[PDB]
Amino acid sequence: SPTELTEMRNDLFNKEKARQLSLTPRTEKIEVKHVGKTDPGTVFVMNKNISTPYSCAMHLSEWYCRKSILALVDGQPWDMYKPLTKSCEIKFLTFKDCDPGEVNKAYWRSCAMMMGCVIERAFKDEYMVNLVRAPEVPVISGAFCYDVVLDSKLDEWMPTKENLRSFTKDAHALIYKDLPFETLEVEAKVALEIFQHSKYKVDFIEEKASQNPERIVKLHRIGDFIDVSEGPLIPRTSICFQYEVSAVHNLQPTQPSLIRRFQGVSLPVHLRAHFTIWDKLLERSRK
């Protein structure tokens, strides 16, 4: 059952948090220098595997909590709610930076994962929804993609407008829930413990674990929903302000099964658009 999948997968996620926190050396304290343009050179003498970059923001100001979205922890993009590991240097990255490449990418991945979180809880109990992946789609393409495999019953099905409107209502309902993103860097073996009932994600974790010199695989969680991704994510679901599931396409080389690709587009609370500009960005995001 999908409810059973939430219970068993979330319980394995909590076993990974339990076997992740209990190896701490009783609150070791590492310092991290705020290397940035503004407020320069303030060390945060913080906890080892407890504190997040959001805690550094909570030491600085509410402005750096609300506005800052990723953290360059030594030149690499890091989640704002990811636990730190060692002594390092933190930049904070917002949408309105001069070169916000990784923030756009993390917003892109986060919106795709929220989309799949809507899709897997969209259908009635007799239709098997089976999510494969999100491809790394550039922002200039106009729409984040999320490839979805459905059952053979819906092989000759195409959603109406009001089906997609119900998907947007479920996604805005998921924005209103204000859910943070739990993150866990896990080895490959427990990731295969979690996603053992979906062959596409088994092969996907087999892609991600072999890419690294370790068998390290990122895992994420919104609420009751665990998904794999490629990079960092947004701190919360509350940041996505405008959200629309625009269209559904079907891939052309479908001999075994329809890898049915879903299209979405979204803008944050910071980069709002006007109603007419947003309608034109809906006219572009259906390809």
Partner: protein, 304 residues
């Protein structure tokens, strides 16, 4: 934090969004130029008792006009700028005495309207209008919403009511607002030159409602009644209305046929739903004149 459309755009995108949204505005306006090549609502003939649509125009300014008796008649110019029919409600869903057409004028930026309003014009297929005015109208005159309304809807010889908001004069005192006489300058008269005198009497221990006092003169809807159309300019969509129209220049006026009891059966020769240039029958000249109007280009008139 309240935003606006120019806020998060770079210098690359601002002329792109300006020219692009303006181009969809001109394309959506030019898509309505074939109302009869669409499926309109059926055209009924005129009947004694029927009412038709008005217009919404701009007050361009005034200019003199001379009749063949050699008399100045001062004339306001009213340009009809992108007037359209926006929604029809019958007398059932209006619960009034008569049906109603919401008709709008003067296309306005899509970035300064409410989202419900932009959903209304997004459904309708037009750029949003500045003013919506509502015309009481019978079932015989009912054009499809979205049809353009032109200046030849009115013809010369027709008498016309024109309503608008008058020029606002703000908090004006008693003499400028109600024309009271005030007090003499000299012979004492310490601090009274422009004041109201008494207000009520001593036995009435209060002031009656509707008492003339200082207050905000102007900026309210008034209507001028019975104003003859001397000339319409078809190429620029101008009405040449007799006399004076309420309101400042470049204000939007609501131009309907006159309700006067001496001018209530002269719609026999007017185009009754509206004028359709799509109908192509006997295309109108550059400018339509009344019988009295001394045209420019006519020789200098002689009274013999």
């Amino acid at each position: 934090s309240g935003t606006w459309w120019d806020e998060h755009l770079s210098e690359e995108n601002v002329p792109f969004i300006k020219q692009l949204v303006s181009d969809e505005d001109k394309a959506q306006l030019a898509s309505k130029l074939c109302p009869l090549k669409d499926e309109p609502w059926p055209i009924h003939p005129w009947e004694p008792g029927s009412f038709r649509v008005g217009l919404i125009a701009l007050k361009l300014g005034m200019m003199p006009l001379w009749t063949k008796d050699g008399q100045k008649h001062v004339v306001t110019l009213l340009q009809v700028q992108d007037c359209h029919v926006l929604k029809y409600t019958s007398k059932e869903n209006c619960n009034g005495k008569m049906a109603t057409l919401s008709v709008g004028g003067k296309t306005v930026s899509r970035f300064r309207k409410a989202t419900s309003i932009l959903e209304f014009y997004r459904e309708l297929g037009l750029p949003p209008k500045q003013t919506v005015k509502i015309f009481n109208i019978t079932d015989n005159a009912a054009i499809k919403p979205g049809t353009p309304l032109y200046a030849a809807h009115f013809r010369p010889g027709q008498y016309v009511d024109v309503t608008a908001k008058t020029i606002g004069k703000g908090f004006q005192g008693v003499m400028k607002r109600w024309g009271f006489k005030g007090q003499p300058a000299t012979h004492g008269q310490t601090k009274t030159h422009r004041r109201p005198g008494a207000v009520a009497t001593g036995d009435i221990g209060r002031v009656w409602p509707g008492t003339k006092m200082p207050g905000k003169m102007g900026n309210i809807y008034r209507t001028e009644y019975g104003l003859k159309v001397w000339r319409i300019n078809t190429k620029h969509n101008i009405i040449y209305v007799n006399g004076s129209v309420p309101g400042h220049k470049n204000c939007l006026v609501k131009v309907k046929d006159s309700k006067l009891p001496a001018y209530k059966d002269l719609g026999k020769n007017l185009p009754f739903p509206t004028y359709f240039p799509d109908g192509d029958e006997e295309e109108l000249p550059e400018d339509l004149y009344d019988e009295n109007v001394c045209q420019p280009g006519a020789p200098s008139i002689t009274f013999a």
